[PDB]
């Protein structure tokens, strides 16, 4: 059985405030520009997961007002999170994606008559905006995400070329810089679509992921998410076909065959164009403090291992600015005198209030903690599973201060609590 | 007469939690691909009824924590439903359907033409999205559904070919996989329309049904539904015109006749294209626990015969993903190198909380239960129309557990009840 | 104004941007309301050449 | 490596710098901020309306 953290962990009155100051990121929104050396210009987009790993100072090592209250030998200390605020800058906007060579044959919403069959390479330049999403979750461990990937066929008759690949639901760990579902599907677009011309340049060679809430809610300890908030909306603007041989033709008994110019049945693979709706400021989730009181698991906002994970997605501020640089000058506006660039800029401000907590190490409590987590007991005196993973690292070792009123979020906290 | 279940059932303080775990369905969204052998790929769509038949363990044989708290001879036991949660996965989206050859003579919104005559086979490739619908129902017996079917023509003058078929309101049982109405009506499209080119592919060969709320509410005992929620919306996007010989010509007195090419009055059968405005996370019903407090009828959430029926329709997550496979590779993007496939995937996680109840079988109670349902008495010591019906069987015989706080719905239930 | 194609419903590969393909364009802006009170003039932020 | 090369007039990839046109939705009288008094009860900072 699993017990609640309220039993063996006792909280204290020692509150602290920390903040990451301004965080900036500037880069291309579609692909990361790289010269022969490496990525000079990274890839920064508004449809990416932002995963912050904040590293906290060790409670035992750093300075305290007095050590007479706690016992160094029979007790230990951990940091617990009790509030946060995520502040964003830059004006509200909408980001536009697209593909120079996208697979789209006809717009079938409203038409007249038939036209001929597709030739070779019937591809057009298409731009659009995506489904509107904004979410934020917090936890001790990196969150899990699901997608649909190609499956491995066991020993059987060898499949002929062109067959439909088997599908599997794959669960992985979300790292910093992964894309989000955009109303086209939460699937591996690099393995399951070989033509590389069915979705825009953002996700045509990447994996879109969706948060796997069903299983992160069924974790025995619930370290993956303390809390989460989400808001999504979209609608369908346009409808169209695709060009390519149909793997599974329409059954002979579902349609009545036509003659003359209606003989060859047109393609029946229908796709739509997603679109987020009106952007507003009264629907925002950010620039607002959140007070953690009760968690949905058993782990009630207690940070193990002196680190914490914050996952953010915000597509409401995703304007791609456009820059122009003059190569030369001419008489009357030559079009080849200018060079056009795209940038996207992102700004963050993470603020937290933490609380100091103590754990009494009896024999059975020690055995229980060892069963839960061996690294916790090992550290109270190695290779982490985050060796190859990617995160945005934010260090807060020298940024703890008990002058709560001197900082904007501390005053809000003092108003809320009152003491 | 009829008496409420509250009169003759007594409730205990024993609670159990059952979870079906993750459930998946993958298949084609329009039809089912069967080779010469069998049906390898089923038909899975978001516009289908989901009927789960949940099978509970027999409380009599099931080993209770206490067997001495009840009389083994003068009393029996039965499971009473207390609360439930339906969990959906996958991101929100919309699904596009259509017909490669659909009956649409002309556009009449901002076009009206009196030029040439309508020739044979004026059909066009048309794609759309349906009406937005959500509903959830819970009961002991499968729900009733009403549609409009061809009536029986009795001993009378023999009808000529082409006469209007008589209409009848037919009530039936909603089974698994039966479609739902999409803004075209609730009729047997297979029998009332013969051309097979009037509605999209996924309904042009089946029956679309609508729940029969009036009769299910008028039922005396109240076993058809304890609980239902619905939410639907649509609007009319495009107006068009059907092509064919007109059965009932417009009366002379209603119009002033024309001349030249206006002498032939155009078709007067007017149809529209439905749509659903917007999908948003603030209008959803699922991923939320419902506490079944008081039933609408007399059956107050009592499960007779160790059965349960849960009916779900949810069109808010209905994206049809598109997969591509590469037959061959050529120099520069031939269209015939690639094969296109359509798939839909649906994921559930049903969670229930049940309570234990006991019945004292006096003379009046035995007679009343015999009048109501003889199977309940015959079981306490068999041909059933459910034998030939198709549902989704969810077995929970070895998934009952009283460790309430170790499961998410258990935590929500304990917090809500307070005690 | 510098605009070439309406990629919403277009994309035919039948031409290339020549010289001076600018067209007359009108529109309405994003809708805003704001009211600030302070003793000192407020600060503003923009993106400038480095 | 992000695209499969075309042929004929598809050989030269078209422009990929995508821009949109903003627009406010609806002007209404129930969404105004002005023509209504405001009372400064408590300031956010330390300076309390001095």
């Amino acid at each position, epitope marked *: 059985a699993v017990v609640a953290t309220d039993a063996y962990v006792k909280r204290t009155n020692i509150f602290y405030h920390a903040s990451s100051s301004r965080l900036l990121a500037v880069g291309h929104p579609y692909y990361s520009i790289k010269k022969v050396n490496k990525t000079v210009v990274p890839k920064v987009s508004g449809y990416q997961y932002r995963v912050f790993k904040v590293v906290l100072p060790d409670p035992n090592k750093f300075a305290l007002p007095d050590s007479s209250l706690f016992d160094p030998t029979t007790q230990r200390l951990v940091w617990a999170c009790t509030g946060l605020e995520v502040g964003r800058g830059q004006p509200l906007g909408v980001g536009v994606s697209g593909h120079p060579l996208l697979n789209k044959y006809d*717009d079938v919403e409203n038409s007249g*008559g038939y036209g001929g069959n597709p030739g*070779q390479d019937n591809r057009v330049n298409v731009g659009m905006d995506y489904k509107q999403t904004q979410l934020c979750m917090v936890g001790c461990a990196p969150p899990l995400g699901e997608h649909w990937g190609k499956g491995t066929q066991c020993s059987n008759t060898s499949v002929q070329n062109g067959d439909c690949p088997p599908l599997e639901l794959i669960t992985s760990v979300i790292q910093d810089g992964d894309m989000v579902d955009t109303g086209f599907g939460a699937m591996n677009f690099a393995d399951l679509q070989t033509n590389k011309s069915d979705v825009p340049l953002d996700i045509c060679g990447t994996v879109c992921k969706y948060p796997d809430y069903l299983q992160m809610a069924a974790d025995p300890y619930g370290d993956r998410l303390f809390f989460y908030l989400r808001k999504e909306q979209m609608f369908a603007r346009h409808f169209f076909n695709r060009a390519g041989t149909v793997g599974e033709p329409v059954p002979d008994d579902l349609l009545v065959k036509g003659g003359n110019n209606r003989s060859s049945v047109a393609s029946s693979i229908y796709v739509h164009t997603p679109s987020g709706s009106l952007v507003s400021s009264e629907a925002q989730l950010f620039n607002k403090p959140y007070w953690l009181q009760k968690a949905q698991g058993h782990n009630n906002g207690i940070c193990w291992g002196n680190h914490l994970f914050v996952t953010v997605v915000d597509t409401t501020r995703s304007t791609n600015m456009t820059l122009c640089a003059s190569v030369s000058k001419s008489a009357t506006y030559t079009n080849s005198d200018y060079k056009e660039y795209m940038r996207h800029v992102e700004e963050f401000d993470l603020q937290f209030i933490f609380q100091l907590c103590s754990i009494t190490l009896s024999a059975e409590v020690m055995a229980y903690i060892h069963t839960m987590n061996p690294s916790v007991l090992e550290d109270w005196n190695k290779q982490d599973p985050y060796k190859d993973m990617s995160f945005w690292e934010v260090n807060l070792k020298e940024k703890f201060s008990s002058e709560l009123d001197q900082f904007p979020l501390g005053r809000k906290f003092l108003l809320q609590s009152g003491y | 007469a009829v008496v409420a279940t509250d009169a003759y059932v007594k409730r205990t303080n024993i609670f159990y939690h059952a979870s079906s775990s993750r459930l998946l369905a993958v298949g084609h969204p329009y039809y089912s691909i069967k080779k010469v052998n069998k049906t390898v790929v089923p038909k899975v769509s978001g516009y289908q009824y989901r009927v789960f038949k949940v099978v509970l363990p027999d409380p009599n044989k099931f080993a209770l924590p206490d067997s001495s708290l009840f009389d083994p001879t003068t009393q029996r036991l039965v499971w009473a439903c207390t609360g439930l949660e339906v969990g959906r996965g996958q991101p929100l989206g919309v699904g596009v359907s259509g017909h490669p050859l659909l009956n649409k003579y002309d*556009d009449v919104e901002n*076009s009206g*033409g009196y*030029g040439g005559n309508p020739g044979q086979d004026n059909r066009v490739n048309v794609g759309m999205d349906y009406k937005q619908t959500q509903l959830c129902m819970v009961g002991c017996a499968p729900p009733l559904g009403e549609h409009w079917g061809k009536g029986t023509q009795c001993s009378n003058t023999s009808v000529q070919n082409g006469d209007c078929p008589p209409l009848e309101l037919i009530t039936s049982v909603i089974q698994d996989g039966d479609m739902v109405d999409t803004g075209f009506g609730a009729m047997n499209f297979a029998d009332l329309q013969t051309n097979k080119s009037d509605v999209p592919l996924d309904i042009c060969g089946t029956v679309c049904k609508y729940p029969d709320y009036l009769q299910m509410a008028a039922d005396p005992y109240g076993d058809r539904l304890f609980f239902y929620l619905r939410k639907e919306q649509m609007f009319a996007r495009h107006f068009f015109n059907r092509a064919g010989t007109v059965g009932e010509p417009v009366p002379d007195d209603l119009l002033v006749k024309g001349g030249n090419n206006r002498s032939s009055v155009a078709s007067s059968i007017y149809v529209h294209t439905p749509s659903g405005s917007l999908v948003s996370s603030e209008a959803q019903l699922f991923n939320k626990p419902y506490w079944l407090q008081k039933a609408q009828g007399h059956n107050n959430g009592i499960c007779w015969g160790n059965h349960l029926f849960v009916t779900v329709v949810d069109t808010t997550r209905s994206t049809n993903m598109t997969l591509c496979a590469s037959v061959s590779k050529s120099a520069t993007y031939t269209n015939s190198d690639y094969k296109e496939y359509m798939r839909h995937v649906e994921e559930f996680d049903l969670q229930f909380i049940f309570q234990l109840c006991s019945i004292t079988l006096s003379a009046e109670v035995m007679a009343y239960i015999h009048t109501m349902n003889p199977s309940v008495l015959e079981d306490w010591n068999k041909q059933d129309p459910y034998k030939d019906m198709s549902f989704w069987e969810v077995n929970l015989k070895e998934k009952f557990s009283s460790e309430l706080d170790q499961f998410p719905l258990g935590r929500k239930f304990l917090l809500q009840s307070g005690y | 104004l510098n605009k070439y194609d309406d990629v919403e419903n277009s994309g035919g590969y*039948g031409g290339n941007p020549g010289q001076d393909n600018r067209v007359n364009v009108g529109m309405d802006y994003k809708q805003t309301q704001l009211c600030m009170v302070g003793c000192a003039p407020p600060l503003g932020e923009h993106w400038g050449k480095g | 490596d992000l695209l499969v090369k075309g042929g*004929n007039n598809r050989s030269s990839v078209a422009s990929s710098i995508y821009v949109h046109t903003p627009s406010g939705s609806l002007v209404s009288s129930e969404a105004q901020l002005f023509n209504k008094p405001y009372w400064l009860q408590k300031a956010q900072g330390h300076n309390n309306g001095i």
Partner: antibody
Amino acid sequence: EVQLLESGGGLVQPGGSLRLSCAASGLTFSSYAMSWVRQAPGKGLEWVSSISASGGSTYYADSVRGRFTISRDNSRTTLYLQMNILRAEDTAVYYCAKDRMGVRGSGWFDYWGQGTLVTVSS
Amino acid sequence: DIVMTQSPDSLAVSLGERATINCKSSQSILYSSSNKNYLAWYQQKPGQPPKLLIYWASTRESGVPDRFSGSGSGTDFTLTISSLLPEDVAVYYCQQYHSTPWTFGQGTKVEIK
């Protein structure tokens, strides 16, 4: 029994504008895509502009793009061409041509109009 | 842009004899999977709109006399009038509709001798 009648030709000063129209008689106008085709006096046939059956999409040539515009009137069954910023090189005869296929159409033409002459000089 | 060149210049054909006209493109027109050549042949008489003769480079229009014929593939195409009559004096054009912009030929003038 399908006919096409054109009207709108005449003289015009350079830099001025003009409008051409084409009317279809015995035809289901809402189905077939259509186009305008120019022919200089004494020269060959040259494409100008094309429109979809429902009027959603249009295509122009490089030398014509930006100045001309093609429009449709299905209720009145008429095809319009608006000419802006005319040059001296556009004096020619214009043809209203009907495609074969419907939605966007394969580019060969069944029936043609009679043609209307446009002159741009002093 | 695909340039279509009509190789034979304006040629005069004797009475009751076959006539041959060659059209050539700067790119391959054939689509290999379906074996379709995107080429059409038009006829125009002096002072009248041109009339369609051949489409898909092989198929013939309704009401067109069987005397005309078309052939070719890839980048070569030929139109042949099997027998010559006085009503066949006209100007013939070859059009490609493989890719935009749709271009016509320079036009060949066919006349009796």
